[PDB]
Design a protein around this ligand. Structure first.
Ligand code: BCL
Ligand code: BCL
Ligand code: BCL
Ligand code: BCL
Ligand code: BCL
Ligand code: BCL
Ligand SMILES: CC[C@H]1c2cc3[nH]c4c(c3C)C(=O)[C@H](C(=O)OC)c4c3nc(cc4[nH]c(cc(n2)[C@@H]1C)c(C(C)=O)c4C)[C@@H](C)[C@@H]3CCC(=O)OC/C=C(\C)CCC[C@H](C)CCC[C@H](C)CCCC(C)C
Ligand SMILES: CC[C@H]1c2cc3[nH]c4c(c3C)C(=O)[C@H](C(=O)OC)c4c3nc(cc4[nH]c(cc(n2)[C@@H]1C)c(C(C)=O)c4C)[C@@H](C)[C@@H]3CCC(=O)OC/C=C(\C)CCC[C@H](C)CCC[C@H](C)CCCC(C)C
Ligand SMILES: CC(C)=CCC/C(C)=C/CC/C(C)=C/CC/C(C)=C/CC/C(C)=C/CC/C(C)=C/CC/C(C)=C/CC/C(C)=C/CC1=C(C)C(=O)c2ccccc2C1=O
Ligand SMILES: COC(C)(C)C/C=C/C(C)=C/C=C/C(C)=C/C=C/C(C)=C/C=C\C=C(C)\C=C\C=C(C)\C=C\C=C(C)\C=C\CC(C)(C)OC
Ligand SMILES: [Ca+2]
Ligand SMILES: [Ca+2]
Ligand SMILES: [Ca+2]
Ligand SMILES: [Ca+2]
Ligand SMILES: [Ca+2]
Ligand SMILES: [Fe+3]
Lengths: 319, 40, 57, 258, 280, 59, 60, 60, 60, 40, 40, 40, 59
């Protein structure tokens, strides 16, 4: 019956803290920070202000462009009739260029807007990684986001520049819509064996799990010992305490081994990065490498073998 | 900002020029090419 | 042009500057594309001759 | 893959790659995992696992140098530590047996209410002033427009019966979040910091029940050296107490139910 | 053995349903009333399964029967024996294992609790673990029941259990459009993003730039207050986390409890109630 | 007509909001035009003339 | 405005900034909304009828 | 106004501002919804009939 | 309102604001929801039938 | 709130007027609209 | 807000001449295109 | 803001020169373009 | 014509941010140029020159 740190019960407030000032080059921060009791009944109720440098704008701009394309072309589809646009929303989208112009600039119509819009969600995305490392260390901060961001941004390119363009196919590159995009993953699994057989996916999974696992534990753990300032990890990292005392101990008399209020945060950043890493891996192999991972698998002695209560015939042979 | 009026311009020129090394390097690249493969 | 100067007393010049620079960078990267995509793909399609078509073959 | 060697191609190479560098990085972590708390203490048992190495397979890493904030000493890791006391007696001499909290456990400072001796220097904010302070100096603050102000709420023992009330709710200059509530006890007529984390709000009856320690225990609550600010050392100190209550405040709690 | 500072927490008792008996440690693990049992199932599984590895498909002789994790897998009984003990060889054994594994996660789960008590801490951990526990039941129990078949669950194959999904998944064609699977997926993603941020940030403040001080929240709470504009807060991250994950699970849990016993058409269709809205 | 009593406008509405909001609107809107138009029949890039210098020169 | 003359009162309860700005947006959007919903099916002067010759006749 | 007589006491329990800005939207939305829904199937005056076939007669 | 005599007491346990505005949403949804159900199925009075198609006869 | 009766009318009058400027502006829009392509 | 009547009227004036600067440059824009490619 | 009329005015011309510089640099871009392959 | 007035800019804009960032701006574009010319315009490598590098090589 103890206040289980769910939603900050009683809150409090103080003026808008525009963060630690920045050196000679970091333009002025911008915004008149706001407060939201609700949002704040979970976290730092203050809102903003936010920075906006060159890449900051430069990137944001290159952002709300593809959107203004992948967004436009899409609406066009349902002949500028929003009503249905609203209906066939989750279905709509913008497809890539036809297998002909494999790499050539597709016409203003046939998959053109997609290559256009694409490149603008190729830069802005890559430019925003800059809007990190930049605003990152200019805080006296090292780089670990910027890092991961790549690992992720890596996989994104393994779904474009690096592979789709690597197989000469302005098609082999994912569409641009929830469902259709939801289909690309579907389509892919097929066109090439069946991904469940490409290790680097069955791998990249365990990770997307671990993260779904760990940052899910340490999120609790912290909480469990959040009374003992566990949440204050920062210092716990430096000057330990009963927090990291009670915590790690848990896992010690649980799964045996254990670690530190520091270490964990490591595996964290790792499993995560070691996810999109393995992602873009398979996705890169699958295409210009093995064509059917199911065959691959068994051909390596991997793929299992069950009895056979059902089998069919083969027209191409008897006929 | 972060500068004055003298040391400031010292840079204006110092770099302005250098850059032209490029524009020039680029132009040799754009002209030497044109001579090679005519693009249109 | 006369009265246009007063704008600098309310809006941070640096802002509009970096704002403009980013605006002309994407646009140009856009236009050359939005056109090279449709109008005249001056790069690959008409000139000078097909060194690849009439050559490779 | 389990038999030995069968197929042979390219991609299957790489699967070996990552699934190698993994077993490398795995160790990296292992080491980085060991920084603090290492090496181990007793021989109550040996290292469970495949290869029972001296002390952990990954040779303990080297010292790490933590450059603390302005006006702050420097910390490192690993960093040998001075053995502590064990105010308790082993229920059994058997390796792995529990240690009973001699005398009054509530303060015997053991397990359920034990703690380390963090630096005796109030953790400060960005520039200088100390982060966690009472709403006294925290005058530039204001209760969340809406949330019922806790200043004046009568605390109530887990036994139910009252146990003093409140005073200043120690906010913070770093994050507008309440972290402590001053509790002018009833018998001591003193001030005992209340760890919000342990304080359950009951905005319906102005109360603030804490199912952690009986009303009386608010007297044995480690007293604050200075009321205008609290140091890391004690930051852990006040907390750890109530903590014990979780397994002390009643003979019931500690002992099994079935 | 004990940690540098563990030696001072190993109080006596704190157990749940009894356990003041085996209330001790071994290596770095606390036993109690649950560390004990879970073990049982463990070998009467980790090894009971070995029997399976031994037996295999046809028999322990069939060229089909192998010893390669990649292939080894214990198959559930045929839908035939609905909600009844199947012949180990034909199904039961599978059930048996599963029988155990249930408790092995129910014990270790509880054992976690006794611990959570000893170390006089919060219990967010187990409570969390439970979801994960549950999602394993509502995916080999809650469902198969509303399908009248135990053998109607899934296998225990190193990768073999993969297909089991492949099928039951296609049983609705584009499983992808399942409303849940969408969200539940989304979470298992968002989680793997925030995580790839917190665990990052921290490891970027406590070990910041060269010749720099162990930064303070006075940075963190601005790090994103700059890039993205706003910062959920520090305490928060360790909330959003459990949230995401402890939801993602419970979601997916729904995701496959309803797929079948609550919906037979191909999911893509479910998405029709949308279209047919008397409006567009 | 409007102007005389419309200076009082800036007396409630900040100059920055109008200066900032309008630029954003004029350009995004400007863009959604050639754009929604370009894709329309009166396309000009690859639609008609001048003489097919591409079709002629290419082949 | 036979009755909407006694409305003067409203302004205090309805903040000028909140009501002024917010309504100039609802218009800025619906503006596009309509032209889009109408441009979509009703009639499309853009691709509905001549002049649409230059596109086909003027093209090749 | 059988009940509208004593109904005045209504302003007292219901916030003037909360109820005023609320109907402001419900009406603002309900109406855009109704013209959206009716116009969709019933009578789509837009792409439905007369006066002339701007598209049909003009396009061709 | 016979209940009233014995029904007044309800309001001491049920906050006026909590139940008043609350039911206001309930009435608003169910309603919208019903037309949605009836209309969509039973008889779609709108696009369903009579007096007769207007856009269909005027279009062709 | 935040305002009083006196400017309550002033803001009231300035805004009411303009509103009718658009009503006349757009009514006229729908006028040339009907002129061009008659609808319904 | 943030100003008085004085600074207010001055802005509005110059601010207008700048707006007619657009309408004129854009109307003349439309017209030039109107002559070339006739829409409708 | 954060400046006076003096320092401001100066900025207005200096950047204005470089601004038209664009209108010019890009006008030569088109005019020589329209020359090459007439569009519309 | 306009060269003289501009030098005063350095005080207002930091050299490092503008100089090192451009260092990239210049490098990024030139990489994504061969990227566009190489991808579509012409493949100076496998284009003209006896593509029979493997037709006369694999043999
Ligand atoms: C057919 C192929 C279909 C498909 C079919 C299915 C099917 C069928 C199912 C899912 C399920 C899920 N799918 Mg799907 N899915 C597809 C594509 C995807 C994609 C994708 C990017 O393409 C994603 C991200 C997902 C994501 C998801 C998750 C939301 C969801 C739950 C997984 C889980 O963690 O259970 C969490 C599970 C557990 C916690 C239990 C295990 C842990 C136990 C308690 C402890 C084990 C201890 C051990 C035995 C002891 C030894 C010690 C060792 C060291 C471990 N799917 C394709 C389209 N998907 C499943 C689901 O919804 O489950 C609810 C499910 O049944
Ligand atoms: C569609 C058929 C015609 C055509 C017909 C038209 C017509 C008709 C018009 C245009 C107009 C424009 N066309 Mg065109 N156009 C065609 C083909 C093209 C092609 C092409 C590659 O083929 C291109 C690149 C363009 C590009 C352009 C833009 C340069 C221009 C403005 C758009 C806008 O939204 O302004 C929006 C404006 C803004 C965001 C800025 C705000 C304006 C105010 C007055 C200034 C701000 C004041 C501030 C406080 C001071 C600080 C100064 C600086 C900002 C620092 N056209 C074809 C051939 N085009 C428009 C135009 O140029 O009008 C003059 C126009 O009306
Ligand atoms: C349908 C077939 C017809 C057609 C029929 C109509 C009809 C019918 C109407 C329009 C209307 C409009 N059409 Mg049309 N239109 C056609 C083709 C076009 C094309 C085209 C490229 O082919 C374009 C670009 C347009 C463009 C336009 C807009 C000029 C205009 C209003 C838009 C709006 O909602 O802003 C909205 C409003 C606001 C942002 C704010 C409110 C305005 C207030 C009074 C003053 C702002 C005050 C503020 C607080 C002070 C600060 C100042 C600044 C904001 C800082 N039409 C075809 C040929 N069009 C409407 C119109 O112009 O009415 C006059 C209209 O009624
Ligand atoms: C289905 C076949 C019929 C049909 C049969 C019916 C039937 C039968 C009924 C309706 C009803 C309604 N129909 Mg119908 N209706 C049809 C076609 C239509 C069409 C159409 C375009 O074709 C439309 C737009 C409507 C619209 C409507 C609504 C006006 C109406 C009430 C909704 C409601 O639940 O209140 C929501 C409620 C509330 C917000 C609050 C509760 C009300 C209380 C008593 C007052 C508030 C008190 C408050 C505390 C004081 C403060 C005052 C202000 C709030 C500040 N119908 C077809 C032709 N319709 C219902 C109706 O009108 O009942 C009168 C009804 O019973
Ligand atoms: C479309 C048919 C023609 C064609 C017609 C045109 C037309 C018409 C125009 C261009 C223009 C450009 N074209 Mg072209 N172009 C063609 C084929 C090409 C090809 C190619 C591989 O085939 C390439 C690589 C280019 C490349 C270029 C760019 C050099 C140039 C500017 C674009 C821009 O807006 O940047 C965005 C701008 C910027 C980042 C900054 C502006 C630079 C100013 C001078 C510096 C500001 C001063 C500041 C205070 C000091 C610091 C400097 C830096 C910021 C550090 N063209 C074909 C053959 N091209 C434009 C041009 O050349 O303008 C001069 C132009 O108007
Ligand atoms: C497309 C048809 C032609 C062709 C036409 C052209 C044309 C036309 C041009 C090029 C240019 C280049 N081409 Mg080419 N090119 C072709 C085929 C190739 C092939 C190939 C394998 O076939 C290659 C490898 C290249 C490669 C190159 C680059 C060397 C060069 C510059 C690109 C760049 O972005 O620099 C990135 C730039 C910079 C970083 C900035 C300037 C360098 C500064 C001085 C270094 C930084 C200094 C800093 C302050 C100090 C810190 C040090 C570190 C940076 C930290 N080309 C074909 C045959 N190529 C351009 C060129 O060479 O200009 C000289 C050019 O204009
Ligand atoms: C294992 C690696 C995981 C990961 C890591 C990761 N993601 C990251 C990072 C990292 C390390 C970042 O550093 C970066 C980030 O958040 O930086 C602050 C990021 C990020 N991950 C993101 C998304 C994302 N990550 C995903 C996944 C993952 N990222 C992996 C699980 C997914 C998926 C598919 O599950 C998504 C969708 C972004 C939030 C952010 C990168 C943002 C970026 O590059 O933005 C560029 C700029 C724009 C898109 C412009 C936006 C335009 C306007 C600001 C908005 C206007 C409205 C909008 C257009 C709506 C339409 C309205 C119209 C009517 C106009
Ligand atoms: C959203 C919740 C996430 C989560 C949370 C989570 N997991 C947890 C916890 C928590 C909070 C723990 O506290 C607990 C832990 O590690 O405690 C120290 C744990 C744990 N999560 C584990 C695994 C695990 N979690 C997974 C997922 C998740 N766990 C979710 C992503 C997954 C997968 C596949 O996604 C796995 C494999 C364990 C390592 C551990 C629990 C260990 C335990 O209680 O083991 C008991 C039994 C044994 C050691 C012996 C096994 C003997 C059995 C008789 C055999 C069972 C056979 C099995 C059913 C077949 C498997 C074959 C498959 C390949 C088909
Ligand atoms: C032929 C042949 C060999 C046959 C085999 C025959 C055999 C061996 C038969 C025996 C079978 C048996 C009995 C097997 C069981 C043996 C046992 C007991 C194994 C241990 C079981 C077990 C659960 C092991 C752990 C499983 C693992 C590694 C899971 C990985 C998940 C993962 C990444 C966990 C992270 C672990 C860490 C680092 C935890 C520490 C940790 C965490 C998580 C915090 O959150 C935290 C917060 C604040 C401060 C500190 C900490 C902290 O230290
Ligand atoms: C009309 O629109 C209005 C005005 C109403 C505004 C609304 C807009 C809306 C609602 C937009 C909505 C957009 C949505 C929902 C988008 C959803 C997108 C999704 C789900 C995308 C999913 C996956 C996308 C992927 C994987 C994209 C990959 C893109 C790549 C890899 C692009 C690569 C580009 C490259 C490499 C370019 C290289 C340059 C060239 C081509 C020249 O090199 C040769
Ligand atoms: Ca598709
Ligand atoms: Ca060409
Ligand atoms: Ca044309
Ligand atoms: Ca027309
Ligand atoms: Ca009509
Ligand atoms: Fe953490």
């Amino acid at each position: 019956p103890e206040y289980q740190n769910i939603f900050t019960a009683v809150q409090v407030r103080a003026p808008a803290y525009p963060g630690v000032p920045l050196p000679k080059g970091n333009l002025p921060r911008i915004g008149r920070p706001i407060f939201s009791y609700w949002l704040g009944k979970i976290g730092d109720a203050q809102i903003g202000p936010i920075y906006l440098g060159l890449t900051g704008t430069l990137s944001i701009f290159f952002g709300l462009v593809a959107i203004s394309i992948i967004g436009f072309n899409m609406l066009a589809s349902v002949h500028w009739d929003v009503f249905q646009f609203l209906k066939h929303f989750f279905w709509l989208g913008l497809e890539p260029p036809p297998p002909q112009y494999g790499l050539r600039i597709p016409p203003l119509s046939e998959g053109g807007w997609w290559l256009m819009a694409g490149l603008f969600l190729t830069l802005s995305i890559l430019l925003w990684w800059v809007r990190t490392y930049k605003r990152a260390e200019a805080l006296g901060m090292s780089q670990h986001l910027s890092w991961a961001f790549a690992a992720a941004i890596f996989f994104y390119l393994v779904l474009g520049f690096i592979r789709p363009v690597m197989m000469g196919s302005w098609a082999k590159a994912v569409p641009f819509g929830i469902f259709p995009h939801l289909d690309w993953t579907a389509a892919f699994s097929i066109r090439y064996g069946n991904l469940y057989y490409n290790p680097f996916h069955m791998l990249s999974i365990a990770f997307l799990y671990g993260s779904a696992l760990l940052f899910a534990m340490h999120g609790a753990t912290i909480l469990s010992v959040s009374r003992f300032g566990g949440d204050r990890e920062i210092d716990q990292i430096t000057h330990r305490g009963t927090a990291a005392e009670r915590a790690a101990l848990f896992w010690r008399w649980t799964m045996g081994f254990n670690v530190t209020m520091e270490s964990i945060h490591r595996w964290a950043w790792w499993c995560a990065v070691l996810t999109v890493i393995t992602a873009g891996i398979g996705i890169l192999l699958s295409g210009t490498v093995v064509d059917n991972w199911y065959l691959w698998a068994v051909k390596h002695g991997m793929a299992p073998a069950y009895p056979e209560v059902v089998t069919a015939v083969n027209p191409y042979e008897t006929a | 900002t972060g500068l004055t009026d003298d040391e400031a311009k010292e840079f204006h020129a110092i770099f302005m020029q250098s850059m032209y090394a490029w524009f020039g390097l680029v132009v040799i690249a754009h002209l030497l090419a044109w001579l090679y493969r005519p693009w249109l | 042009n006369a009265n246009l100067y007063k704008i600098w007393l309310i809006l941070d010049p640096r802002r509009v500057l970096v704002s403009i620079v980013a605006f002309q960078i994407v646009l140009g990267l856009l236009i050359h594309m939005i056109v090279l995509s449709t109008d005249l793909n001056w790069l690959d399609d008409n000139i000078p001759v097909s060194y690849q078509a009439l050559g490779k073959k | 893959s389990a038999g030995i060697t069968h197929y042979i191609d390219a991609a299957q190479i790489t699967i070996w790659a990552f699934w190698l560098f993994f077993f490398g990085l795995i160790i990296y972590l292992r080491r980085e995992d060991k920084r603090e708390g290492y090496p181990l203490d007793s021989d109550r048992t040996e290292r469970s696992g495949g290869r029972v190495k001296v002390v952990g397979f990954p040779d303990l890493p080297d010292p790490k140098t933590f450059v603390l904030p302005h006006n702050g000493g420097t910390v490192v890791a690993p960093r040998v530590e001075a053995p502590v006391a064990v105010n308790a007696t082993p229920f059994s001499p058997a390796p792995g047996s529990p240690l009973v909290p001699n005398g009054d456990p509530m303060l015997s400072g053991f397990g359920p209410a034990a703690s380390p001796d963090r630096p005796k220097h109030c953790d400060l904010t960005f520039e200088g002033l100390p982060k966690i302070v009472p709403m006294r100096v925290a005058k530039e603050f204001s209760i969340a427009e809406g949330d019922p102000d806790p200043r004046g709420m009568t605390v109530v023992g887990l036994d139910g019966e009252v146990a003093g009330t409140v005073s200043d709710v120690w906010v913070d200059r770093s994050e507008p979040q309440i972290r402590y509530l001053e509790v002018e006890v009833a018998a001591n007529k003193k001030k005992v910091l209340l760890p919000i984390g342990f304080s359950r709000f009951d905005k319906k009856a102005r109360k603030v029940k804490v199912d952690a320690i009986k009303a009386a225990h608010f007297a044995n609550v480690p007293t604050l050296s200075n009321p205008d600010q609290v140091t890391l050392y004690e930051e852990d100190k006040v907390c750890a107490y109530y903590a014990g209550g979780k397994l002390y405040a009643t003979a019931e709690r500690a002992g099994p139910l079935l | 053995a004990m940690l540098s500072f563990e030696k001072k927490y190993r109080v006596r008792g704190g157990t749940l349903i009894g356990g003041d008996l085996f209330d001790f440690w071994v290596g770095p693990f606390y036993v109690g009333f649950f560390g004990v049992v879970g073990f049982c199932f463990t070998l009467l599984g980790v090894l009971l399964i070995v029997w399976g590895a031994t037996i295999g498909p046809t028999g322990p002789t069939s060229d089909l029967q192998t010893y390669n994790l990649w292939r080894i897998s214990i198959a559930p009984p045929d839908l035939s024996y609905g909600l009844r003990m199947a012949p180990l060889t034909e199904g039961g054994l599978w059930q048996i294992i599963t029988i155990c594994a249930a408790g092995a996660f129910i014990s270790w789960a509880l054992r976690e609790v006794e611990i959570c008590r000893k170390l006089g801490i919060g219990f967010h951990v187990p409570f969390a673990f439970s979801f994960a526990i549950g999602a394993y039941l509502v995916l080999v129990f809650v469902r198969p029941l509303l399908m009248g078949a135990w053998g109607h669950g899934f296998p225990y194959g190193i990768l073999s259990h993969l297909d089991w999904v492949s099928n039951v998944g296609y049983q609705f064609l584009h499983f992808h459009y399942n409303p849940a699977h969408m969200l539940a997926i989304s979470f298992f993603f968002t989680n793997c993003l925030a995580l790839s941020m917190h665990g990052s940030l921290i490891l970027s403040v406590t070990n910041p730039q060269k010749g720099e001080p162990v930064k303070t929240s006075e940075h963190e709470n601005t790090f994103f207050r700059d890039i993205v504009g706003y910062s959920i807060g520090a305490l928060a991250i360790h909330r959003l986390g459990l949230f995401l994950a402890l939801s993602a699970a419970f979601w997916s849990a729904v995701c496959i409890l309803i797929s079948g016993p609550f919906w037979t058409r191909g999911w893509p269709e479910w998405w029709n109630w949308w279209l047919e809205l008397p409006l567009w």
